[PDB]
Structure 1
Amino acid sequence: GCTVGGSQTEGNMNKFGTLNFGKTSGTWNNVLTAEVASAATGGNISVTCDGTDPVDFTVAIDGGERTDRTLKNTASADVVAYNVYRDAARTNLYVVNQPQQFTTVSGQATAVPIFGAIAPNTGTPKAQGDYKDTLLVTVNF
Protein backbone atom coordinates (compact mmCIF):
# COMPACT_ATOMS: atom_id res chain seq x y z
CA GLY A 1 0.00 0.00 0.00
CA CYS A 2 0.51 3.76 0.00
CA THR A 3 0.90 6.00 3.10
CA VAL A 4 0.21 9.69 3.82
CA GLY A 5 2.88 11.71 5.68
CA GLY A 6 2.46 15.06 7.43
CA SER A 7 -0.44 13.89 9.58
CA GLN A 8 -0.72 13.52 13.35
CA THR A 9 -3.08 11.02 14.94
CA GLU A 10 -5.71 13.10 16.78
CA GLY A 11 -7.08 10.33 18.99
CA ASN A 12 -8.34 7.82 16.39
CA MET A 13 -8.66 10.28 13.48
CA ASN A 14 -5.74 11.43 11.28
CA LYS A 15 -5.20 15.20 11.71
CA PHE A 16 -3.91 16.21 8.27
CA GLY A 17 -3.48 19.95 8.70
CA THR A 18 -4.85 23.46 8.92
CA LEU A 19 -6.16 25.91 6.30
CA ASN A 20 -5.46 29.16 8.12
CA PHE A 21 -6.75 32.21 6.23
CA GLY A 22 -5.60 34.45 9.07
CA LYS A 23 -7.27 37.54 10.50
CA THR A 24 -9.72 39.69 8.53
CA SER A 25 -12.22 42.55 8.82
CA GLY A 26 -15.99 42.36 8.42
CA THR A 27 -15.84 43.23 4.72
CA TRP A 28 -12.74 42.17 2.75
CA ASN A 29 -12.24 43.26 -0.90
CA ASN A 30 -9.30 40.98 -1.63
CA VAL A 31 -9.79 37.21 -2.10
CA LEU A 32 -8.55 35.72 1.21
CA THR A 33 -6.11 32.94 0.34
CA ALA A 34 -3.99 30.48 2.38
CA GLU A 35 -2.41 27.04 1.93
CA VAL A 36 -2.84 23.94 4.07
CA ALA A 37 -0.18 23.54 6.78
CA SER A 38 0.40 19.89 7.77
CA ALA A 39 -0.09 19.28 11.51
CA ALA A 40 3.06 17.14 11.76
CA THR A 41 5.69 19.28 10.02
CA GLY A 42 4.08 22.63 9.18
CA GLY A 43 4.65 22.31 5.44
CA ASN A 44 2.56 20.57 2.78
CA ILE A 45 1.09 17.08 3.25
CA SER A 46 3.70 14.69 1.81
CA VAL A 47 2.18 11.47 0.51
CA THR A 48 4.68 8.70 -0.26
CA CYS A 49 3.92 5.22 -1.58
CA ASP A 50 5.57 2.00 -0.44
CA GLY A 51 6.96 0.17 -3.47
CA THR A 52 9.04 0.31 -6.65
CA ASP A 53 6.57 1.03 -9.47
CA PRO A 54 5.01 4.50 -9.72
CA VAL A 55 1.54 4.17 -8.14
CA ASP A 56 -1.41 6.36 -9.19
CA PHE A 57 -3.28 7.41 -6.04
CA THR A 58 -6.27 9.68 -5.75
CA VAL A 59 -7.20 12.57 -3.47
CA ALA A 60 -10.78 13.49 -2.51
CA ILE A 61 -11.94 16.26 -0.17
CA ASP A 62 -15.50 16.43 1.16
CA GLY A 63 -17.82 19.47 1.66
CA GLY A 64 -17.01 20.25 5.31
CA GLU A 65 -19.18 19.94 8.41
CA ARG A 66 -22.32 21.28 6.74
CA THR A 67 -21.54 19.79 3.25
CA ASP A 68 -21.47 23.19 1.44
CA ARG A 69 -17.93 24.39 2.31
CA THR A 70 -18.96 27.12 4.76
CA LEU A 71 -17.04 28.10 7.87
CA LYS A 72 -19.32 28.67 10.85
CA ASN A 73 -18.87 31.17 13.63
CA THR A 74 -18.24 29.39 16.93
CA ALA A 75 -21.02 31.37 18.69
CA SER A 76 -23.40 32.95 16.13
CA ALA A 77 -24.89 31.30 13.02
CA ASP A 78 -23.01 33.39 10.44
CA VAL A 79 -21.36 31.42 7.61
CA VAL A 80 -18.34 32.08 5.37
CA ALA A 81 -18.36 30.27 2.01
CA TYR A 82 -14.95 29.00 0.78
CA ASN A 83 -13.40 26.41 -1.58
CA VAL A 84 -10.22 24.35 -1.86
CA TYR A 85 -8.28 24.24 -5.15
CA ARG A 86 -5.40 22.01 -6.23
CA ASP A 87 -3.28 24.33 -8.36
CA ALA A 88 -1.56 27.60 -7.36
CA ALA A 89 -3.82 29.74 -9.61
CA ARG A 90 -7.14 28.73 -7.89
CA THR A 91 -8.40 27.06 -11.11
CA ASN A 92 -8.42 23.26 -10.63
CA LEU A 93 -11.06 22.90 -7.93
CA TYR A 94 -11.19 19.90 -5.60
CA VAL A 95 -14.78 19.10 -6.51
CA VAL A 96 -16.89 17.76 -3.59
CA ASN A 97 -16.46 13.97 -3.13
CA GLN A 98 -14.29 13.61 -6.25
CA PRO A 99 -11.01 11.69 -6.69
CA GLN A 100 -8.62 14.31 -8.04
CA GLN A 101 -5.86 12.01 -9.57
CA PHE A 102 -2.19 12.07 -8.44
CA THR A 103 1.12 10.36 -9.30
CA THR A 104 3.87 9.06 -7.01
CA VAL A 105 7.26 7.43 -7.75
CA SER A 106 9.48 5.19 -5.61
CA GLY A 107 11.91 6.81 -3.16
CA GLN A 108 10.06 10.13 -3.28
CA ALA A 109 7.25 11.90 -1.42
CA THR A 110 4.65 13.82 -3.47
CA ALA A 111 3.05 16.92 -1.92
CA VAL A 112 -0.74 17.39 -1.80
CA PRO A 113 -1.41 21.06 -2.41
CA ILE A 114 -4.73 22.00 -0.84
CA PHE A 115 -4.98 25.67 -1.76
CA GLY A 116 -7.78 27.51 0.02
CA ALA A 117 -9.58 30.51 -1.42
CA ILE A 118 -12.39 32.76 -0.17
CA ALA A 119 -14.48 35.11 -2.35
CA PRO A 120 -14.39 38.87 -1.77
CA ASN A 121 -17.23 39.76 0.61
CA THR A 122 -18.11 43.38 -0.16
CA GLY A 123 -21.75 43.15 0.87
CA THR A 124 -22.57 42.36 4.50
CA PRO A 125 -20.04 42.43 7.37
CA LYS A 126 -20.00 39.01 9.09
CA ALA A 127 -20.07 39.07 12.91
CA GLN A 128 -16.82 39.20 14.93
CA GLY A 129 -15.26 36.00 16.26
CA ASP A 130 -13.64 32.82 14.97
CA TYR A 131 -15.02 30.93 11.94
CA LYS A 132 -14.19 27.21 11.61
CA ASP A 133 -14.73 24.09 9.50
CA THR A 134 -13.25 20.60 9.40
CA LEU A 135 -12.75 19.32 5.87
CA LEU A 136 -12.19 15.57 5.72
CA VAL A 137 -9.49 14.83 3.13
CA THR A 138 -9.79 11.28 1.75
CA VAL A 139 -6.61 9.81 0.28
CA ASN A 140 -7.94 6.67 -1.41
CA PHE A 141 -6.70 4.11 -3.85
Structure 2
Amino acid sequence: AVTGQVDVKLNISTGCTVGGSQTEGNMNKFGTLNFGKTSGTWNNVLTAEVASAATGGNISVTCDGTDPVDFTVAIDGGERTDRTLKNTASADVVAYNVYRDAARTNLYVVNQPQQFTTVSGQATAVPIFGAIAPNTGTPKAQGDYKDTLLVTVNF
Protein backbone atom coordinates (compact mmCIF):
# COMPACT_ATOMS: atom_id res chain seq x y z
CA ALA A 1 0.00 0.00 0.00
CA VAL A 2 1.91 3.02 -1.30
CA THR A 3 -0.34 6.07 -0.84
CA GLY A 4 0.92 9.35 -2.30
CA GLN A 5 -0.05 12.99 -2.99
CA VAL A 6 -0.68 14.80 -6.32
CA ASP A 7 -0.99 18.56 -6.01
CA VAL A 8 -3.57 19.95 -8.45
CA LYS A 9 -3.31 23.60 -9.50
CA LEU A 10 -4.97 26.23 -11.70
CA ASN A 11 -4.16 29.96 -11.83
CA ILE A 12 -7.33 31.80 -12.78
CA SER A 13 -6.12 35.34 -13.65
CA THR A 14 -5.48 36.24 -17.35
CA GLY A 15 -5.12 33.39 -19.88
CA CYS A 16 -5.02 32.49 -23.56
CA THR A 17 -7.64 30.41 -25.47
CA VAL A 18 -7.53 28.21 -28.59
CA GLY A 19 -10.30 28.64 -31.20
CA GLY A 20 -11.23 26.24 -34.00
CA SER A 21 -11.68 23.27 -31.69
CA GLN A 22 -14.77 21.23 -30.85
CA THR A 23 -15.15 19.43 -27.54
CA GLU A 24 -15.14 15.70 -28.38
CA GLY A 25 -16.58 14.44 -25.09
CA ASN A 26 -13.96 15.68 -22.59
CA MET A 27 -11.09 16.07 -25.07
CA ASN A 28 -10.61 19.10 -27.38
CA LYS A 29 -10.89 17.99 -31.04
CA PHE A 30 -8.53 20.43 -32.79
CA GLY A 31 -8.76 19.24 -36.37
CA THR A 32 -7.89 16.83 -39.16
CA LEU A 33 -4.75 16.31 -41.26
CA ASN A 34 -6.34 14.79 -44.34
CA PHE A 35 -3.76 13.70 -46.94
CA GLY A 36 -6.56 12.35 -49.13
CA LYS A 37 -6.60 9.23 -51.29
CA THR A 38 -3.44 7.59 -52.65
CA SER A 39 -2.12 4.49 -54.42
CA GLY A 40 0.16 1.80 -52.98
CA THR A 41 3.31 3.53 -54.22
CA TRP A 42 3.27 7.36 -54.51
CA ASN A 43 6.22 9.24 -56.08
CA ASN A 44 5.09 12.72 -55.04
CA VAL A 45 5.38 13.88 -51.41
CA LEU A 46 1.78 13.67 -50.11
CA THR A 47 0.98 16.99 -48.45
CA ALA A 48 -2.09 18.45 -46.67
CA GLU A 49 -2.86 21.11 -44.05
CA VAL A 50 -4.77 20.75 -40.80
CA ALA A 51 -8.48 21.57 -41.07
CA SER A 52 -9.98 22.78 -37.75
CA ALA A 53 -12.97 20.67 -36.63
CA ALA A 54 -15.03 23.75 -35.70
CA THR A 55 -14.69 25.96 -38.79
CA GLY A 56 -12.82 23.97 -41.44
CA GLY A 57 -9.97 26.47 -41.73
CA ASN A 58 -6.80 26.80 -39.65
CA ILE A 59 -6.78 26.63 -35.84
CA SER A 60 -7.14 30.24 -34.67
CA VAL A 61 -5.57 30.85 -31.27
CA THR A 62 -6.48 34.17 -29.63
CA CYS A 63 -5.25 35.44 -26.25
CA ASP A 64 -7.64 37.07 -23.76
CA GLY A 65 -5.46 40.10 -23.01
CA THR A 66 -4.39 43.52 -24.25
CA ASP A 67 -0.58 43.40 -24.28
CA PRO A 68 1.10 40.91 -26.62
CA VAL A 69 1.40 37.37 -25.21
CA ASP A 70 4.04 34.83 -26.26
CA PHE A 71 2.43 31.37 -26.27
CA THR A 72 3.96 28.10 -27.33
CA VAL A 73 2.78 25.19 -29.47
CA ALA A 74 3.92 21.57 -28.99
CA ILE A 75 2.80 18.49 -30.92
CA ASP A 76 3.53 14.96 -29.71
CA GLY A 77 4.60 11.83 -31.70
CA GLY A 78 1.17 10.30 -32.33
CA GLU A 79 -0.38 7.11 -30.96
CA ARG A 80 2.80 5.05 -31.30
CA THR A 81 5.21 7.98 -30.54
CA ASP A 82 7.05 7.79 -33.92
CA ARG A 83 4.59 9.70 -36.18
CA THR A 84 3.31 6.67 -38.12
CA LEU A 85 -0.23 6.23 -39.37
CA LYS A 86 -1.52 2.71 -38.81
CA ASN A 87 -3.88 0.75 -41.00
CA THR A 88 -7.18 0.16 -39.22
CA ALA A 89 -7.04 -3.62 -39.93
CA SER A 90 -3.48 -4.70 -40.84
CA ALA A 91 -0.22 -3.69 -39.11
CA ASP A 92 1.20 -1.61 -41.98
CA VAL A 93 2.55 1.83 -41.00
CA VAL A 94 2.96 5.12 -42.89
CA ALA A 95 5.65 7.47 -41.55
CA TYR A 96 4.80 11.21 -41.67
CA ASN A 97 5.75 14.55 -40.03
CA VAL A 98 4.14 17.89 -39.24
CA TYR A 99 5.92 21.15 -40.15
CA ARG A 100 5.12 24.74 -39.17
CA ASP A 101 6.07 26.69 -42.30
CA ALA A 102 4.64 26.38 -45.84
CA ALA A 103 7.93 25.03 -47.28
CA ARG A 104 8.09 21.90 -45.01
CA THR A 105 11.32 23.16 -43.35
CA ASN A 106 10.55 24.22 -39.75
CA LEU A 107 9.59 20.88 -38.22
CA TYR A 108 7.38 20.62 -35.15
CA VAL A 109 9.93 18.56 -33.24
CA VAL A 110 8.42 15.86 -30.97
CA ASN A 111 7.43 17.28 -27.53
CA GLN A 112 8.92 20.71 -28.27
CA PRO A 113 7.41 24.17 -27.66
CA GLN A 114 7.57 25.83 -31.07
CA GLN A 115 7.22 29.58 -30.04
CA PHE A 116 4.36 31.84 -31.25
CA THR A 117 3.21 35.48 -30.89
CA THR A 118 -0.26 36.86 -30.45
CA VAL A 119 -1.22 40.54 -30.53
CA SER A 120 -3.95 43.01 -29.52
CA GLY A 121 -7.49 42.08 -30.64
CA GLN A 122 -6.38 39.35 -33.02
CA ALA A 123 -6.52 35.60 -33.59
CA THR A 124 -3.23 34.02 -34.73
CA ALA A 125 -3.41 30.89 -36.90
CA VAL A 126 -1.50 27.70 -36.02
CA PRO A 127 -0.28 26.21 -39.28
CA ILE A 128 0.19 22.48 -38.84
CA PHE A 129 1.47 21.49 -42.27
CA GLY A 130 1.58 17.74 -42.83
CA ALA A 131 4.03 16.03 -45.15
CA ILE A 132 4.65 12.40 -46.16
CA ALA A 133 7.81 11.08 -47.86
CA PRO A 134 7.64 9.54 -51.33
CA ASN A 135 7.17 5.78 -50.93
CA THR A 136 8.64 4.23 -54.08
CA GLY A 137 9.63 0.93 -52.50
CA THR A 138 6.89 -1.31 -51.11
CA PRO A 139 3.15 -0.84 -51.75
CA LYS A 140 1.34 -0.51 -48.39
CA ALA A 141 -1.87 -2.56 -48.03
CA GLN A 142 -5.25 -1.10 -49.07
CA GLY A 143 -7.51 0.53 -46.49
CA ASP A 144 -7.56 3.57 -44.21
CA TYR A 145 -4.46 4.72 -42.29
CA LYS A 146 -4.97 6.83 -39.14
CA ASP A 147 -3.20 8.59 -36.26
CA THR A 148 -4.23 11.01 -33.53
CA LEU A 149 -1.62 13.67 -32.88
CA LEU A 150 -2.15 15.48 -29.58
CA VAL A 151 -1.42 19.19 -30.10
CA THR A 152 -0.44 20.91 -26.83
CA VAL A 153 -0.98 24.67 -26.71
CA ASN A 154 0.84 25.59 -23.49
CA PHE A 155 2.02 28.71 -21.79
What TM-score range do you get, normalising by the shorter chain? over 0.9
Q: Which runs of 5+ in 1 are unaligned?
A: none
Q: Distance in 2 between matches of 1:64 and 1:138?
A: 12
SS of residue paired to 2:134: coil
Q: Distance in 1 between matches of 2:90 and 2:67?
A: 51
Offset at residue 126 of structure 1 (A)? 0.0
Q: Output one character per residue of 1:32-51: Cα deviation in whole Å (capped at 9) or x when no partner.
A: 00000000000000000001
Paired-residue identity, % = 100
Q: Which runs of 5+ in 2 are unaligned?
A: 1-14
Match of 2:47 in 1: 33
Match of 2:6 in 1: none
Q: Output one character per residue of 1:15-70: Cα deviation in whole Å (capped at 9) or x when no partner.
A: 00000000000000000000000000000000000010000000000000000000
Q: Output one character per residue of 1:102-138: Cα deviation in whole Å (capped at 9) or x when no partner.
A: 0000200000000000000000000000000000000
1:58 equivalent to 2:72? Answer yes
Match of 2:10 in 1: none
Bigger strand fraction: 1
Offset at residue 83 of structure 1 (A)? 0.0
Q: Distance in 2 between matches of 1:20 and 1:110?
A: 22
Q: Distance in 2 between matches of 1:54 and 1:133?
A: 34
Find runs of 4+ consecutive structure 1 residues off by over 2 angstroms: none
Q: CA RMSD in A?
A: 0.2
SS of residue paired to 1:125: coil
Query: Is this contact kept in 2: 1:50–1:106, CA < 8 A?
Result: no
